[PDB]
Design a binder for this molecule. Structure first.
Ligand SMILES: *[C@@H]1O[C@H](CO)[C@@H](O[C@@H]2O[C@H](CO)[C@@H](O)[C@H](O)[C@H]2NC(C)=O)[C@H](O)[C@H]1NC(C)=O
Ligand SMILES: *[C@@H]1O[C@H](CO)[C@@H](O[C@@H]2O[C@H](CO)[C@@H](O)[C@H](O)[C@H]2NC(C)=O)[C@H](O)[C@H]1NC(C)=O
Ligand SMILES: *[C@@H]1O[C@H](CO)[C@@H](O[C@@H]2O[C@H](CO)[C@@H](O)[C@H](O)[C@H]2NC(C)=O)[C@H](O)[C@H]1NC(C)=O
Ligand SMILES: *[C@@H]1O[C@H](CO)[C@@H](O)[C@H](O)[C@H]1NC(C)=O
Ligand SMILES: *[C@@H]1O[C@H](CO)[C@@H](O)[C@H](O)[C@H]1NC(C)=O
Lengths: 49, 49, 90, 202
C-alpha cells in the first residue's frame, strides 16, 4: 500500500466537514444449474448385458 | 506406466485442477483477512498514549 | 522432508514479513484513528477520547473513564502482561 | 463478473469431463461397449464390460463428490447472501465493513443470472480539518463533558461538533453534563458555558 504516516497527538482531532455518497458493488452467487444423472443411460447404452 | 495413464488422463486433469483451486483459495484466504486496508499506517514515534 | 516423492509444497503468496506488516498497519490505524480508517480516510484522535468513545458504545457514560484513567490503563497493562505470560506456558 | 462466471464454467467443464470419460477404455480393448459385444462373445468379454463398469462408476462417483462440494459452497454463499439481504437490504445494519466499505445507509438488490448483486449505499467522509481537542471543560470547578459531540477549537474559541460532520455550536448547558470536580482529568482546559437560562430570567 501507500506508505503514509498519521499525525498523532494527545490534543489533536480531525473532524470531517464534507462527505461523498459512494456505491459499492458486491457479487454473490446463490444458485447453479440443476443437472440429473442416471446410470442406465450414462453407464450403459442400448445393451441389456 | 505412462502409456496406461492415458486411459485415466481425465482423472489426472480433475485432480490437478482441484489442487490448483485449493492452492488459489488458500492464497485468496490471506488477502480477505489481512488486506482490509490499502494504506500502510506508520506507528508514530511518540509512545505517550 | 516430504518432497522427495513429487509432493511439492507451494510457497505462499504473502510471506510472514508482509503479514506482520499488515498486522502492524492495522494496529497503528486502530490506535491512532479508531474506526475512521476502516470506513474512510484516517482521522487523528487521542487514545483516551477513543476509549471513551468505545465506552459510550456499551451504554457507559464517558465521564467515568477520565475520572479513573490511571486505573484503566494499569488494568490494561496488567491484562497484557497476563496474556503474554499465559501464552508462554499450547 | 468473476463470481458468477466461475460457477457456470466449472459446471460446464465438469460436464465436458464427464462426457470425455466415456471416450476412454480404462485399460480395456475398446471404449464403446457395443464394439466388444459385436466382436467378442459375452462369456469372454465379461471382464472388459465389468472393467468399463468400474471405470464409469469411479468417474460418476468423483463427479458426484465434486458436485456435492460445490453445492456445499453454494449453500454457504447463499446463506451469506440471505443474511446480507435481511440485514443491509431489509433495514440498516450496524455491522461495520459488512455491507460495503463505509457507513452503510441502504442497499438495492438486483436480479442476476444464478446469483444476486447488492448496490450498497455507503457514507464516507471526503474532507477533514485538523483541530485541537480537550476531553473536558473546566467552567467553575465543575468539569463539563459533551453528551454526543466532542470539544474542538479553531485556535481562539471552542465549539462542540458531532463525530462524522463539522457543525460548530456554542458551548452551552443543553449539550453538556457535569460530573465531579475539576481536578480529576489529566488534560483539561479552561472556558465558559453559555447557560442560556441566565439572559432569559432578566
Ligand atoms: C462537498 O463535496 C462536493 C463534491 O465535490 C462539493 O460539490 C461540488 O461543489 C463545487 C463548488 O461548489 C461544484 O462546482 C461542483 O459541481 C459540486 N459537485 C457536485 C457533485 O455537486 C461540495 O461543494 C462540497 N461541500 C463543501 C462544503 O466543501
Ligand atoms: C474561530 O472561530 C471564531 C468564532 O466563530 C471566529 O470569531 C468570529 O469570526 C468572524 C469572522 O470574521 C467574525 O465576524 C466574528 O465577529 C468573530 N467572533 C468573535 C467572538 O471573535 C474566529 O475568527 C475563528 N478563527 C479562525 C482562525 O478561524
Ligand atoms: C484554569 O483555571 C484554574 C482555576 O481557575 C487555574 O488554577 C489556578 O492557578 C493559579 C495560578 O496558576 C493559582 O494561583 C490558583 O490557586 C489556581 N486555582 C485553582 C482553583 O486551582 C489554572 O491555572 C487555569 N489554567 C490555565 C492554563 O490558565
Ligand atoms: C493538521 O496539521 C498537522 C500538523 O499541524 C498535520 O500533520 C496534519 O496533516 C494536518 N491535517 C490536515 C487534514 O491537513
Ligand atoms: C501531550 O504530550 C506532550 C508530550 O509528552 C506533553 O508535553 C503535553 O503536556 C501533553 N498534553 C496533554 C494535554 O496531556
Amino acid at each position: 500500500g501507500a506508505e503514509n504516516s498519521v499525525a498523532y497527538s494527545n490534543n489533536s482531532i480531525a473532524i470531517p466537514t464534507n462527505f461523498t455518497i459512494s456505491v459499492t458493488t458486491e457479487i454473490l452467487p446463490v444458485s447453479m444449474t440443476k443437472t440429473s444423472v442416471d446410470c442406465t443411460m450414462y453407464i450403459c447404452g442400448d445393451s441389456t448385458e | 506406466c505412462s502409456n496406461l495413464l492415458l486411459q485415466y488422463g481425465s482423472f489426472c486433469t480433475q485432480l490437478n485442477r482441484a489442487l490448483t483451486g485449493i492452492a488459489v483459495e488458500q492464497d485468496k484466504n490471506t488477502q480477505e483477512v489481512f488486506a482490509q486496508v490499502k494504506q500502510i499506517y506508520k506507528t508514530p514515534p511518540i509512545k505517550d498514549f | 522432508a516430504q518432497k522427495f516423492n513429487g509432493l511439492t509444497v507451494l510457497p505462499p503468496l504473502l510471506t510472514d514479513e508482509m503479514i506482520a506488516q499488515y498486522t502492524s498497519a492495522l494496529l497503528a490505524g486502530t490506535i491512532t484513528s479508531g474506526w475512521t480508517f476502516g470506513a474512510g480516510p484516517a482521522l487523528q484522535i487521542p487514545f483516551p477520547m477513543q476509549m471513551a468513545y468505545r465506552f459510550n458504545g456499551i451504554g457507559v457514560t464517558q465521564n467515568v473513564l477520565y475520572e479513573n484513567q490511571k486505573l484503566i490503563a494499569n488494568q490494561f497493562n496488567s491484562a497484557i502482561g497476563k496474556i503474554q505470560d499465559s501464552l508462554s506456558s499450547a | 463478473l468473476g463470481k458468477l462466471q466461475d460457477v457456470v464454467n466449472q459446471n460446464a467443464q465438469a460436464l465436458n469431463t464427464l462426457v470425455k470419460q466415456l471416450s476412454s477404455n480404462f485399460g480395456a480393448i475398446s471404449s464403446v461397449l457395443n464394439d466388444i459385444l459385436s466382436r467378442l462373445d459375452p462369456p469372454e468379454a465379461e471382464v472388459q464390460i465389468d472393467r468399463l463398469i468400474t471405470g464409469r462408476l469411479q468417474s460418476l462417483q468423483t463427479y458426484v463428490t465434486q458436485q456435492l462440494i460445490r453445492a456445499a459452497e453454494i449453500r454457504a454463499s447463499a446463506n451469506l447472501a440471505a443474511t446480507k439481504m435481511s440485514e443491509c437490504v431489509l433495514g440498516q445494519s450496524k455491522r461495520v465493513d459488512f455491507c460495503g466499505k463505509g457507513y452503510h445507509l441502504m442497499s438495492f438488490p438486483q436480479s442476476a443470472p444464478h446469483g444476486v448483486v447488492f448496490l450498497h449505499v455507503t457514507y464516507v467522509p471526503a474532507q477533514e480539518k485538523n483541530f485541537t481537542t480537550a476531553p473536558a471543560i473546566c467552567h467553575d470547578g465543575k468539569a463539563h463533558f459533551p453528551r454526543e459531540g466532542v470539544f474542538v477549537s479553531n485556535g481562539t474559541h471552542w465549539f462542540v461538533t458531532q463525530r462524522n460532520f463539522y457543525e460548530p455550536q456554542i458551548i452551552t448547558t443543553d449539550n453538556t453534563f457535569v460530573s465531579g470536580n475539576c481536578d480529576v482529568v489529566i488534560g483539561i482546559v479552561n472556558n465558559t458555558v453559555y447557560d442560556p437560562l441566565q439572559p432569559e430570567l432578566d
